[model samples]
Each structure stands twice: as C-alpha cells, then as structure tokens.
Target: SELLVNTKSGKVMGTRVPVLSSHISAFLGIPFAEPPVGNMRFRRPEPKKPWSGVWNASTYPNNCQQYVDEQFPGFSGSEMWNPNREMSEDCLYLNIWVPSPRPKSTTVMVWIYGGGFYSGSSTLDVYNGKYLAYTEEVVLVSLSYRVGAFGFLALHGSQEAPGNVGLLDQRMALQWVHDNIQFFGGDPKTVTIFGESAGGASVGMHILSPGSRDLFRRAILQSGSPNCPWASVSVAEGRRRAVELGRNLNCNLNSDEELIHCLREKKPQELIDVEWNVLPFDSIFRFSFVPVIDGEFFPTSLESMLNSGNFKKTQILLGVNKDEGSFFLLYGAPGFSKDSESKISREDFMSGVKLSVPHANDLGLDAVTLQYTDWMDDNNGIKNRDGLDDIVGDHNVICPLMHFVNKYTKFGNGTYLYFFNHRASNLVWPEWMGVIHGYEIEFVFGLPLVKELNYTAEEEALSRRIMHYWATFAKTGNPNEPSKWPLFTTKEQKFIDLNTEPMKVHQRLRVQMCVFWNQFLPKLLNAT
Candidate 1:
C-alpha cells in the first residue's frame, strides 16, 4: 500500500512494507535540496524548488557521483555498486522510514554515512532504516551529500568553491528535517544526529557551527572527532591540492575563477578520473580532500573551537572499538606479512608507528613503543601482533577521542562514553583480531537487517538492548534503563562496555598509554 504526504516542497507518496508485527511507511528519494549541478556546482546547497504534482517516491533515487572500487568484495563490493544505481549529479535527496499508525510526534534519528569524506551514500543496505524504525518506534532518516573534490575542494579566498560544501549540504538536510519532519510524524525538537568515522566528524563539525545548533538535541559520535588527523585539512594545503587537481584535469591553472569555470565544463567522470595522487599505501589514514576552515562555514580552527568552548553544549555519546587499527593495518600497513596474515615484525611495527604519527620525534616515538611493548609476548622482539595494533589504534583514533571527551566533559555536559569489544565471527576478519572499526554498525541497526550473518541468541539479545538504549536516548536525554547507564565525568570517567554482556565499568581506557600520547608526546614534540 502507498500513501501520500504533503511536504514543504510538494506531495510525496511512499510504499508500506511489513515489519515484525506491523507495517511501516518508507519514503524513498525525497529531494531535500536542488541538485548541485550546473551553476549551482560547488556552492552551498539551495532549497529544493516546489513541484506541481504528487511525486512518486516509491523508488530509490540517484546517488552522488563517486569513485567505485571493483576489487573490494561483499559489503565492500556493494559499497561501489550502490552508488552506481541511477547515479547522477542530481543527488541531494534523502530517505525516510516512519512507523505506521503514526503517532503525533515520534523521536527522529538522522544518520550521516561515513566514507572518509570521499565516498559513501545513504542508499546502502546497511543504512536501511526498516528494522530500527519498526523495533525502536522512531522515525529514521538518512540523506545524501557531495563527496571528494565536488564536496570538499577549497580555493583560497574564492566564494565559488569554498571547502565543506558537504558539511553545508548536511546543514541544509537538517534544516529540511526541522521544517518538514512533522509531516512524516517526527518530532523536530527531538532529532538526534549520529554517524560513524568521517560522518562522526561531520556531527562534530555541526556542533561547532552556529548555523546547525538548533537542528538536533544530541549526537552519537562513533570512532571519530574533529581532532582526528584525517577529519580536516589545512587551508593552505587544501588550496595546493585543489590546484594540483585542476592542473591534473587540464583545466585553467591561471586563477581561482578561471579554474572553477573550466572544472564546471568538464564531465563528472572526467573530474572523478583525475588522479588525486594519494598514495595507496597510506590510504587508511589519509584523506585527499576533506572539510576546511573556509572563514564562512568553519570560521575558526577546530582546535580553537575546542579551546574556547565554542561548540554547542549538546548531549553526546562517544567511543571506539578495541582493535580499531586492525582493520586499517590489514588494508594499508606495509608491515603486514602476507603468508602469516597476522605477524608484523619488530622493525616493521616501529616503522608503522612512525607512519601513524609522523609528527613525533625519536624520543617520543621510543617512549610510545616502550609503553606498548607486550612483555609477556615480546618474545620475538615484536612480541605479539596486538601490540602493533594497539599502538596504531591509540595514535590515530583512541587517544584523540579520549582527549576530546575529557575536554568536553570538563564543562559538565551530559555525556555517555562507551567501549565496543564485541566481534561477530561471520564478518570479514581473521579470528585473532578483536572487534574492529565499523563492527558495531551491525548491532546498532539490528542483526536481522544485516545480511549473511549467523548471529546467536545472545547476539540478537545484545542488538535489542543496544536499539532500546539508542531509542531511549533519542526519546529523552538519557540512555539509562534505570540507574544502569552512568553519566561520564572528568573525575571518575565511567563508561559503558557494549558487548555480549552490557554493563558499566569505571576506569579510563588505557590510562597510562593515553597519558603518554595525549600529554607527554605533545609536550615533547612542542619542546623540540
């Protein structure tokens, strides 16, 4: 069955699909903004023009133009293929899923997908909102935004192609939700924005932006923050990369105006084909083009925002996985042994650490390695492979996350911290590896929606528990089921451990190692 709803733009009709006990209405491919094509290219998103007739929104819409990888398989293969379905420049649409027999105003969860700010769309199967919308009884929404050069390329002092159009696109989407979500039976005042990795950083960016403060009441940041190295780029360096990209495409290299004009004339594939010269070896932590301080959208440096406490005092949920580095090292580390697939030698381990933290001096690097050394397994000088994983994970993701959380809780905001250590055997990873990056997504969305998994009863129960927690947080300001989930503070630093057994634990995660990386290393590097 299909039903129609009138939005701010026009009337849109969506299809109804059966869930466990009841049916839910899914409105696919509803335009949030006008396509960023033609003269609108590389500019801040403009509101979608009103349409005359009822729009048949039963089918999925076109995705943003992006680079697709043929080698990567399964969910990876599908990541490339999902964007190719009716792919076009007209890609500023969003999808919505609302529970049937809709309430007056249900809490809403808006998802921003992550692909290092270079890839990702809202149409992926993993992002499908049916399960969560039905089980949690929340209005679920996901939206598309520009990526790669189209989204983030910056020209110094140019209004045409300022960086962070992707961020602005998100801002427009949130505004759309605020103005129109009521039509879909969602509460505009209770919106919760959540994302993973680069998308997590996007959530943080919105918190810092003055324009986006009123759009959402809370945020859930997974495995990322504004301080993460790959989250943003320096303005000077971004301009250099933009110039290089323009020259690579054989566009005008004279001025920003001429260059942008030439780039606009080229085909979308031509722009996607131009080699950005990013090293394949460093692909894990390197983002060729990302958000930048354009003086308009991002008025100040991210660090400056944090130091001055310029961000909104919104409730937040922040955490990372146990072996966050394992996933990255498996894909990009030169030290990984092909035959063993697990062993990384002592020399290669240290070399990998240097690659992870290029800013650290010899003394700081030495101290980092000393702290990570597994004395029990330091058998082969390298000891165990987990040590290498720990160092890289801490250097790139964990330490930066904890440091930001500490600074944030200093203001006594309602913040809930978590550590995810659950591993599903069916996933694409060796058994030795702990729960790695992107693993929690399966449970967050619920296990049944996730494809090709033989999850046990315990795993399914865990999924239900997590969904309830997230839904409760979106409904109210807290995620506790009673007095269970404690508020994170700078003093005790208590956090929830999300695994087979969900419970609270009181302790800083790897406190000694975090101190070395966050305090000791920064001071030592500055002193030198």
Candidate 2:
C-alpha cells in the first residue's frame, strides 16, 4: 500500500515521497516547509528541513485555528467537527492523492480550500481525492497554512515584517510540489491551482503576485472574486491595521525584535482569537482574515496585471454560485445588513460599493438604490422555482464577481466564466439556493464518500464528469474542450455556463455591470 521515494535533500522523507507505487497512491500530512512557529512566526516561509529517513505521511496536519467547530467540524460533513482535530502555528503540511505510482505523467491539481483565510483544512473528508485520482489518472494535492492573525495580521511598519505568511506558505508548497511531484507520477510541468471562496481570492492574488505566476499553468476560481468590496484595502492600510494589532496586543512596533518575540511567545489559541476579532468599522462582514497586498509578496493589483496580459499563457475557469452568500446567511454570517425593518441600509450598502467601484456615484444615488432594490427583487426570485426556496442572492457575490469577469474578458486571456444553477439535494436550502458555494467541489471531486451527498449514484456520475473536465484542464491546459475553449476577447466576452443541462457558452456574461464600472467606478489595481 505504500511506496518509497527519493528527494534531493538526501533525506528519506518516506515511502509516499518515492513515487514507485502502482495504482492509487496517497501521501498525507507531508511537511512542505519548516514549521512556521517560534521566530519564524511572521517571517516568510522557510525550507522544510530534510529528514534522514522515510517519514510517515499518513495523517493530516492540524487545520490551525479556525471558526467554531459547529460550522466545518472535522473532515467531511461528518462527526460534529471534532474540536479535537488540531490547531497550531507550526502547520505547513500538505497531502497528495494519485491514481498510480511511478511517473504516470498525470496532470496535477493543487487545491486550496476556502475559509476566508481563517479556517478550513485539507483534512476534510469530503475532499477525498480517490475518485479524481483513479478516474482521471491525475495527481491531487491539498495543504494548510497559517490562518487568522498568525497568517495575515498586518504589521506593516513593524520591524518584524509585513504579513501574508499564509500566501508565502502556499508558494512554498507549490515549490515543494514542483521539486518532488515527479516522484508521485505527476508532471510538474502541467500543474493547475484551484480553490473556492477565499481560496479563489487567493488564486486571484497568486495570479497577480510575482511569486506565484510561475507556480501553476492554469487556475479554477469558484464563488469568489478579487474585485469585491472586501478586497479593496491597500497595503498602506494593511500596515495601519498591523499597527493597530500591535497596539491591541500591547506590543511595540518600533521594536521589531521585541514585537515579533512578544507575539510568538503568546499562546496560539489566544493569538488566533485575537486575530479573528480585529476588524475595522469598514469591513463588509467583519472579515478579519484576508490576503493583504503589501508591496512585498503581492506587489501589484491582480486586476491590473491580468489586464496587461500577465495570465495570457494560463487557462482560467472562473465562476460564482447562483447564490454564494446565501449559505453565509444560513450559517448566520451577514450576507447583507438587515438593520432596517422594511429595507437594507443604503449607506452600509453603498459604502462597500464606493470603496470597490471607482464611480459608484456616477449613477444617481437615488436611482441606483431604486435599481438595486428592483434587481434584488427579480434576482431574489420571490417565488420558488418548482417549490424551491426563495432566495435573494447577494450583490456582493454577483456584482464584484461580475467586475472580475468583465476585466478578464476584456483585457485578459483564455477566461471561462460559468454560472452554477444545478440543485442536487433535498435540502430545502440547496433546492432554493441552487448550487451555492462549496457545492461544486463535491461534483468536481466526484463519487463523494462524504455525508453531504450521502454518496448518491447520480451525484457520483456528476462528480466524475466535473472531475474529468477539471483534470483535463490540469493536464492539457484545457478543460476537456471539443475544439479548445475560446479565449475571452474584449469584444465577444464569451463565457461557459455549467448546469444539469449540457454546457452552455454565453457571450458578454455581465455586459451591463462591466459598462457601469468601466465607465464610472474603475480603480487602479495590483497590476497597475
């Protein structure tokens, strides 16, 4: 069941490290970097020390500090998330699942899980890569990095270093994969990076980050976009936030040495809780965890760089759920503010818009508000389609995401934008929500053994199909195209729509929103 592999370190990490096995090899909890604890807390990710012998990679690393177990619990949608799973600062580990051993030359997919940079782990059972491994003859990988304050707490002016440790950790894992994936029968040359929600946002960051451009050849983004209101903060603002953290923690930023030492010496859980609670009055949802574009690791705005054709060589599969923020409401996370009895807060709504869109005021403020109300009405679909739940999707999810598609379709490369409208379960919400966030992942992984799907036969087939298309992209830089997916041009703005019905390609997916933002509220991005 296990095979040995060799590494350049002369360090015999383990049998899993050696890619000489036959059929369905899995290596879990492999250390991809030196632990990011102690003095290494806020520092950039360091090289993992080479071991002298075979390392046992049979378990998952702790998921680090995450939200309450009531939400994501442990692996899969099983067992009331066992708070017993693990959390730590020294957690830069990864897992790999492959169909066969010994240089199968399979396409590789490195998954980055969504948690808004706070919680979520590769250890989730629902993420079982066995189906994709065997069916697609591909290599599957997932990893964990610092979350909360430990990962992205901005100490901009602090002598220590700017945050974004989590992102650096991701880059380190990619480097490890590039160097050692061949042992797992994966072609390092054909790697695709994929994720959802926060993970998708991270993917967007990687597209713009200088450190990540060379890491993967393609990307899959689901239910999240970089141009959202939450992503509007600048690096200078990030540094300001870090200074606030220092003030809150009673640490002096002027003394980088003492500051780093003080923070690292604190208990890990306490630090994580503090990190999760740090929010400015301006946040859309009190989101404490995010990738800050400090000039260091992520220098330019992703939008600007991609517009300049930075990702022209990479294939893109980007999409949003029909109702991404609905689950957030289901989970009690604020999809929209409900302070007003008969309506939502206008300032609260437009505050986020003004920050994200350059000319949010171009439209008559009164007219825009009326328009949003009407749009929200129609889009919310007051009547359930076939007795499905009536859900009004979030403008946050749709509008900014539309901005992302518009930019890429105009000035970018091969971009495929899709809308997920398929409902696969009896869950009242799923029926009404119509393929919300985290839903696509199940089908994309195929044949779910997780309780979420109850492993239905129909679900398995769909999973296989999704996985096949995804894996095809990972391998050939194309997602199982009949004659290759077309590059989204400035004029045509072509997009792919995914549903229970056969795939549908549409042109000018968000033409109206594009015109609105482009003509009025455009802002300079990381690429600029």
- Highest lDDT scorer: 1
Q: What lDDT does the true structure give each of the candidates?
A: 0.80, 0.62
For residue 348, model 2's alpha carbon misses the true position, in angstroms, by 12
Q: Which ten residues in a row have the lowest lDDT in candidate 1?
A: 73-82
Candidate 2 stretches with Cα past 4 Å from truth are 10-23, 69-84, 157-159, 250-258, 310-312, 331-368, 375-395, 409-413, 426-432, 448-452, 455-458, 481-487, 513-528
Query: What global local distance difference test value does model 1 have?
Result: 0.80
What would the per-residue lDDT of candidate 1 be over residues 164-260, giving only the tens digit for each residue? Answer: 8989899989999999999999999999998888888888888888888888889888888777877787788888888888888887898999899
How big is the positional error of residue 376 in model 2, measured in Å on the Cα after superposition?
A: 13
Show the lowest summed lDDT stretch of 10 residues, model 2: 383-392
> Which digits, one per residue and each the tens of the lDDT, describe model 2 over residues 1-528?
335556653333332322213346677778888887777777778888777867776666676665554554342432323333666666788888866444567688898877767777777655666666767777888876776777776666553557788888888898888888887778888888888877887777777677787877788887777665554367676666656666667776676566667777777765655664456653333366567766666556665665675543566787766656445443442223123121223343444333323333445433334434444343332321211111123345565666666666554546666777666663323343446666777677763534444656655655666777787767765666563445566677666666555567777655554454344333323222
Clashes of each: 1, 21
